[PDB]
Enzyme design. Structure first.
Site, PDB file in Angstrom:
ATOM      1  N   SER A  43       2.141   0.278   7.848  1.00 24.24           N
ATOM      2  CA  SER A  43       1.636  -1.083   7.803  1.00 24.24           C
ATOM      3  C   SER A  43       2.756  -2.118   7.896  1.00 24.24           C
ATOM      4  O   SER A  43       2.462  -3.310   7.939  1.00 24.24           O
ATOM      5  CB  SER A  43       0.750  -1.330   6.613  1.00 24.24           C
ATOM      6  OG  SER A  43      -0.590  -0.970   6.927  1.00 24.24           O
ATOM      7  N   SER A 101      -2.822  -5.454   3.301  1.00 27.97           N
ATOM      8  CA  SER A 101      -2.599  -4.436   4.307  1.00 27.97           C
ATOM      9  C   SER A 101      -3.926  -3.938   4.907  1.00 27.97           C
ATOM     10  O   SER A 101      -4.082  -2.752   5.227  1.00 27.97           O
ATOM     11  CB  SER A 101      -1.767  -3.319   3.715  1.00 27.97           C
ATOM     12  OG  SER A 101      -1.010  -2.745   4.755  1.00 27.97           O
ATOM     13  N   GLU A 141      -5.110   1.279  13.995  1.00 25.80           N
ATOM     14  CA  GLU A 141      -5.402   1.801  12.674  1.00 25.80           C
ATOM     15  C   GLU A 141      -6.642   2.668  12.828  1.00 25.80           C
ATOM     16  O   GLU A 141      -7.556   2.276  13.561  1.00 25.80           O
ATOM     17  CB  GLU A 141      -5.798   0.676  11.717  1.00 25.80           C
ATOM     18  CG  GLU A 141      -4.646  -0.228  11.299  1.00 25.80           C
ATOM     19  CD  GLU A 141      -3.690   0.431  10.326  1.00 25.80           C
ATOM     20  OE1 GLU A 141      -3.862   1.653   9.987  1.00 25.80           O
ATOM     21  OE2 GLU A 141      -2.733  -0.271   9.949  1.00 25.80           O
ATOM     22  N   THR A 210       4.903  -3.770   2.929  1.00 22.72           N
ATOM     23  CA  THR A 210       4.982  -2.329   2.722  1.00 22.72           C
ATOM     24  C   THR A 210       4.300  -1.588   3.871  1.00 22.72           C
ATOM     25  O   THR A 210       3.507  -2.138   4.650  1.00 22.72           O
ATOM     26  CB  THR A 210       4.318  -1.954   1.401  1.00 22.72           C
ATOM     27  OG1 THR A 210       2.920  -2.205   1.496  1.00 22.72           O
ATOM     28  CG2 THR A 210       4.840  -2.723   0.213  1.00 22.72           C
ATOM     29  N   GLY A 211       4.632  -0.299   3.971  1.00 21.83           N
ATOM     30  CA  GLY A 211       3.837   0.628   4.741  1.00 21.83           C
ATOM     31  C   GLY A 211       3.785   1.991   4.057  1.00 21.83           C
ATOM     32  O   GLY A 211       4.747   2.401   3.402  1.00 21.83           O
ATOM     33  N   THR A 212       2.632   2.661   4.195  1.00 24.39           N
ATOM     34  CA  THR A 212       2.397   3.952   3.585  1.00 24.39           C
ATOM     35  C   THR A 212       1.560   4.758   4.570  1.00 24.39           C
ATOM     36  O   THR A 212       0.718   4.183   5.266  1.00 24.39           O
ATOM     37  CB  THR A 212       1.653   3.810   2.254  1.00 24.39           C
ATOM     38  OG1 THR A 212       2.331   2.877   1.427  1.00 24.39           O
ATOM     39  CG2 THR A 212       1.576   5.107   1.476  1.00 24.39           C
TER      40      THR A 212
END
Length: 266
Positions: A43, A101, A141, A210-212
């Site tokens: 993200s 996100s 996504e 952030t990204g996960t």
């Protein structure tokens, strides 16, 4: 030397691959660890995505209504879920994409940017317009979070994404009014408290995205400001691909990497 050894110990302890980039300044050398290795954006791309949409359109475009249906929600979408019947404005989609996100919000922005089919190419093109010749977005996504380790699709590098964020937040890629919207949305984000933010003292300002993802992927990109207002850009990326697609991400790995950086910049 010392910092390389410290970062290597993080990798051993978390059973992870870690990437770190902090650009040089007039008084500090670059901090680099696997800085030019590819890592999945996850993200993190949402920050430059919002920048692209801001850049491409007048301010009044933020008030354009986008409608969609529940069949369009194919990813974790805490805001877009609640607005199927009404639609959301481009501005509301930007807010959701950065601050929650929201996955559907990012897909709708992609479609606004590049049309149906052309979004990921247009997004990548925006990065090219910023002098990032390395990063690539290929899927929307949620697939963009799920590519197998080693695949170049949907990847950036700590180095590349740091320079992108630097241009967006600290440079003049956007006019000041648009720059401030991006910056504000990042400042009000609801997901990064345990990442780079957790490695910097409270009198440092931090804004981040952030990204996960799968394979224990956990990233954070930030701009930080010292107590006297001196800016730095910090990219930390990680995966734990050895554990397979369902490997647990480790936010603390990013917090620790950030603590190492903060120790150098103090």
């Amino acid at each position: 030397g010392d910092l390389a050894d410290r970062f290597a110990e993080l990798e051993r302890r978390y059973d992870a691959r870690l990437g770190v980039y902090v650009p040089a300044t007039g008084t500090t050398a670059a901090i680099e660890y696997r800085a030019d290795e590819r890592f999945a954006f996850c993200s993190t791309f949402k920050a430059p995505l919002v920048a692209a949409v801001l850049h491409q359109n007048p301010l009044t475009h933020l008030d354009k209504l986008i409608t969609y249906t529940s069949d369009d929600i194919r990813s974790r979408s805490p805001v877009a879920q609640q607005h199927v019947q009404t639609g959301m404005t481009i501005g509301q989609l930007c807010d959701a994409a950065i601050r929650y996100s929201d996955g559907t919000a990012a897909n709708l922005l992609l479609a606004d940017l590049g049309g149906p089919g052309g979004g990921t190419a247009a997004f990548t093109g925006y990065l090219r317009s910023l002098g990032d010749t390395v990063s690539r977005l290929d899927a929307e996504e949620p697939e963009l979070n799920r590519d197998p380790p080693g695949d170049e699709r949907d990847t950036t590098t700590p180095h590349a994404i740091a320079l992108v964020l630097q241009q967006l937040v600290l440079g003049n890629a956007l006019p000041p009014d648009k720059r401030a919207l991006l910056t504000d949305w990042m400042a009000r984000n609801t997901t990064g408290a345990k990442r780079i933010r957790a490695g910097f003292p409270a009198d440092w300002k931090v804004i981040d995205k952030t990204g996960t993802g799968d394979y224990g992927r956990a990233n954070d990109i930030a701009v930080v400001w010292s107590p006297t207002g001196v800016p730095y850009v910090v990219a930390v990326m990680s995966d734990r691909a050895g554990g397979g697609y369902d490997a647990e991400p480790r936010e603390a790995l990013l917090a620790e990497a950030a603590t190492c950086v903060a120790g150098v910049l103090a």
